[PDB]
């Protein structure tokens, strides 16, 4: 029934998330403006949105209990291969089922399927991404479950390149138990039915998205004119 340490962790993550995810999306105004006038017209603005996002996810990961104890190189492997996934996960907070899109305080900062298509993305990528957002939303997770899911996604032991898996897995386990115990205590029915199973699954879907949307990246960065319109961080983290 939630130990004191497990409440400690929950509080850490909720605060960490709060310090890394602004609901007013004020900074969005410092991005290169969006253009919906024009192939790839939305590449600069989203490039910047993602780049900004990569940063917040990094700041979020540092506040994950036990993540600091990790080796430097490991910390790199985990963020380098989870970033896209966590961005997609954290983005469910601005995703609305009304018109199926990511609303961020205004129409100008509201991104629909056709705006993502303006960043060089076919439906073979978008279709699944949307299915995801809808499925993840349907879960109606609690902010606690939400921030835990992200953390658990970042500290995954099977990521290629991990050297101290045993240590990483130990970090994950602690987190999973906190979510499982939490789903039992603070989540009533039918709000906690296979709630943990549908979640672990969403992690599998993510891996599938990663694989798919990463290949597209190489297809887009492979052209120097396109690569030229991204940011440094994006090139560093997503490969160069």
């Amino acid at each position: 029934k939630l130990s004191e340490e497990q409440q400690h962790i929950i509080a850490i993550l909720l605060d960490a998330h709060h310090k890394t995810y602004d609901p007013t999306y004020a900074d969005f105004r410092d991005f290169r403006p969006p253009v919906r006038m024009s192939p790839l017209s939305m590449l600069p603005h989203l490039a910047d949105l993602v780049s900004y996002s990569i940063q917040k996810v990094i700041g979020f990961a540092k506040m994950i209990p036990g993540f600091r104890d990790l080796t430097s190189d490991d910390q790199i492997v985990l963020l380098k291969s989870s970033a896209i996934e966590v961005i997609m996960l954290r983005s469910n907070q601005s995703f609305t089922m009304d018109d199926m899109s990511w609303d961020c305080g205004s129409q100008d900062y509201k991104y629909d399927v056709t705006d993502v298509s303006k960043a060089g993305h076919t439906l073979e990528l978008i279709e699944p991404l949307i299915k995801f957002q809808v499925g993840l939303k349907k879960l109606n997770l609690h902010e606690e479950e939400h921030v835990l899911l992200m953390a658990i996604c970042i500290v995954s032991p099977d990521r290629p390149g991990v050297q101290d898996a045993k240590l990483v897995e130990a970090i994950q386990d602690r987190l999973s138990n906190t979510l499982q115990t939490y789903i039992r205590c603070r989540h009533p029915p039918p709000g906690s039915h296979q709630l943990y199973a549908k979640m672990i699954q969403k992690l599998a879907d993510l891996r599938s998205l990663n694989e798919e949307h990463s290949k597209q990246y190489r297809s887009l960065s492979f052209q120097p004119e396109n690569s030229m319109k991204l940011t440094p961080l994006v090139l560093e983290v997503f490969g160069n």
Binding site: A61, L233, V237
Partner: peptide, 11 residues
């Protein structure tokens, strides 16, 4: 591979 920027955001 050397990730100066990612490395700086962590530390």
């Amino acid at each position: 591979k050397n990730h100066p920027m990612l490395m700086n955001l962590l530390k």
